[PDB]
Ligand binder design. Structure first.
Ligand SMILES: Nc1ncnc2c1ncn2[C@@H]1O[C@H](COP(=O)(O)OP(=O)(O)O)[C@@H](O)[C@H]1O
Length: 244
């Protein structure tokens, strides 16, 4: 089963804004008849805040294919980037409406070395060509995730490309409660568990780390042959995730 919005907690504003992307992908013709359409949307936030989960959730809510691409695939220098970019969008266009998710978009079009210049330029221009090539109601939504929006190439954020953004920040104490409670639905919660106390002791943690706390507490409780996941198991898992 694909992701849904009910899997995303601690950033209600982001999913509310992205619901518009779901409504477009469900019916691009009906969406356009009211009169501006989105092509590229930037997801901005630290690692583990659920940018990939949101992108997958938008495809799941809309019922459209999801295509993944990582900007990190060009970290070493290795292969032809433009061929990778061209083939990905061809598969997405053939399955439109669809979602293309570009993780670590800051990597594409980076400065890098003068030796890297010919490699970086061809990959960047290929992405720019595919985005500019979407006609009318092409059906393809491009979601780009980055932790460093100031590091993006200026060509990427020009009008008609990645000209809309959605912040996916670290959850506050209320969001951490919602995240902890959501993943705690899958565990047998003990009688002394205080999720609010745990959320108050996890300021700065991402949703991924919070999910890790719930899962590590359940495993630790199972190893001790306990009948339920107790507060001591959450405290142990919290310290393990925080110390890294
Ligand atoms: N906001 C969130 N709400 C619920 N779970 C989350 C959230 N953010 C992250 N997670 C959990 O952490 C996992 C990894 O998150 P991910 O989408 O890869 O984050 P990102 O792409 O921002 O680094 C998700 O599959 C999910 O289980």
């Amino acid at each position: 089963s694909n992701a849904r919005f009910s899997d995303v907690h601690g950033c209600d504003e982001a999913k509310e804004e992205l619901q518009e992307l779901v409504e477009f992908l469900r019916n691009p013709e009906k969406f356009s008849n009211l009169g501006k359409l989105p092509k590229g949307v930037l997801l901005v936030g630290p690692p583990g805040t659920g940018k990939t989960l949101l992108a997958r959730a938008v495809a799941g809510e809309a019922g459209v294919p999801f295509f993944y691409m990582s900007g990190s695939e060009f970290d070493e220098i290795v292969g032809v980037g433009a061929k990778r970019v061209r083939e990905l969008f061809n598969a997405a266009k053939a399955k439109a409406p669809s979602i293309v998710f570009i993780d670590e978009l800051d990597a594409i079009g980076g400065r890098r070395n003068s030796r890297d210049a010919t490699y970086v330029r061809q990959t960047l221009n290929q992405l720019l060509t595919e985005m500019d090539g979407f006609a009318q109601n092409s059906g393809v939504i491009i979601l780009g995730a980055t932790n460093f929006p100031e590091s993006l190439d200026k060509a990427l954020t020009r009008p008609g490309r990645f000209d809309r953004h959605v912040h996916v920040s670290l959850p506050d104490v209320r969001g951490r409660i919602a995240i902890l409670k959501h993943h705690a639905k899958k565990i047998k919660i003990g009688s002394d568990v205080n999720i609010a106390a745990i959320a108050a002791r996890t300021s700065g943690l991402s949703g991924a780390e919070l999910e890790n706390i719930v899962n590590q507490a359940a495993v630790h409780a199972s190893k001790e042959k306990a009948k339920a996941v107790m507060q001591a198991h959450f405290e142990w898992a919290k310290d393990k995730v925080i110390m890294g």
